């Protein structure tokens, strides 16, 4: 069972008055644990999972100081990007940053990432080796030269392979009761008659954790994609996920169809029949 | 825990 820790940062400029709207969120796998919102009253990195509330005032002061420096970096980046792209002060623009680390089943370093977008387009990303940069355009190429000269990749590689992994291992232990628990999908099938000759079979997966899952339909033991509809996995709002897959079938032939469920919480894939 | 070193673009 692989694990990840990721942080997501969004800054949106507010033309006309004041500093950008800055939102930062932290995740361990599919569980949000921290947040910072510049529009909020506290002006603190805030807890969003019970297991992070175990952290003392030193943790919260440290995360708050760092997150505020992240907000100021993005405010400066929005100004810099506006100049690189020769844009006016009239429009609102967005900078997004995402970084973090993945650990494998051994809770040891597997992958590190640090990427940036401007107005929803790739700008600059640290490559898989954590040694080089992918600059999407000439504006990003200028940032790449600056960061190579200042040995940014090396300092990032140290956090990504080191610090990031140590925090994840700590969070995984402290939040064991939920973070290390897998919630297998609760499955069922619904049937809806469209007409006297056509029916819809819907296969539901509910209350599962992690969000990663596969729902497939088979007809007579063979994979069926034609006449199938699959919704995007969605949050239930209690920390679990939901998904469904439907197939349109000729009325009376429902028994040829089987729904197949794959999930980390299931030792063996599940088969459902009407 | 977040990155302690932020670099401008």
């Amino acid at each position: 069972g692989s694990h990840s820790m990721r942080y997501f940062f969004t800054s949106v400029s507010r033309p006309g008055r004041g500093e950008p709207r800055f939102i930062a969120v932290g995740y361990v796998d599919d569980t949000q644990f921290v947040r910072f919102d510049s529009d909020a009253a506290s002006q603190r990195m805030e807890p969003r999972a019970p297991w992070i509330e175990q952290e003392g005032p030193e943790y919260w002061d440290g995360e708050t100081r760092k997150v505020k420096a992240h907000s100021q970096t993005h405010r400066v980046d929005l100004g810099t990007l506006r100049g690189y792209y020769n844009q006016s002060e009239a429009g609102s623009h967005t900078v997004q940053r995402m970084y973090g680390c993945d650990v494998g089943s051994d809770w040891r370093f597997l992958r590190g990432y640090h990427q940036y977008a401007y107005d929803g387009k790739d700008y600059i990303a640290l490559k898989e080796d954590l040694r080089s940069w992918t600059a999407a355009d000439m504006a990003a190429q200028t940032t790449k030269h600056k960061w190579e000269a200042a040995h940014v990749a090396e300092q990032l590689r140290a956090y990504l392979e080191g610090t990031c992994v140590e925090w994840l291992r700590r969070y995984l232990e402290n939040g064991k009761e939920t973070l290390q628990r897998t919630d297998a999908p609760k499955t069922h099938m619904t049937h809806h008659a469209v007409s006297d000759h056509e029916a819809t079979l819907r296969c539901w997966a509910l209350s599962f954790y992690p969000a990663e899952i596969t729902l497939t339909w088979q007809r007579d033991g063979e994979d069926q994609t034609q006449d199938t509809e699959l919704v995007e996995t969605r949050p239930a709002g209690d920390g679990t996920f939901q998904k469904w897959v439907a197939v349109v079938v000729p009325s009376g032939q429902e028994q040829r169809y089987t729904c197949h469920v794959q999930h980390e919480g299931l030792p063996k894939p599940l088969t459902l029949r009407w | 825990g977040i990155l302690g070193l932020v670099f401008t673009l």
Binding site: F8, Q96, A236 | -
Partner: protein, 99 residues
Amino acid sequence: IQRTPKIQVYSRHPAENGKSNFLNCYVSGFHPSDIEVDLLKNGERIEKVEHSDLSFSKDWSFYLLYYTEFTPTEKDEYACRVNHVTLSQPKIVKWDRDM
């Protein structure tokens, strides 16, 4: 860039008439982040609606979950109203207990 939101309206728990539950409106795949989301009860805006903290997927597009407590019934119609720069008119998606 301008990406239109995908919208799903659904309950947190299996819908049973007369039983306390949560109505959700999941908005995803949109850019920029500014969006107007309202949950409707019989075409009327529901007052106490909360939403998750702004986050984004690998492709940079945003997602948000808007939610409120509700008690489904046979008569009551529930829906989610979404407005975004990419939309000419607010988009209404009705809640369907089956979907």
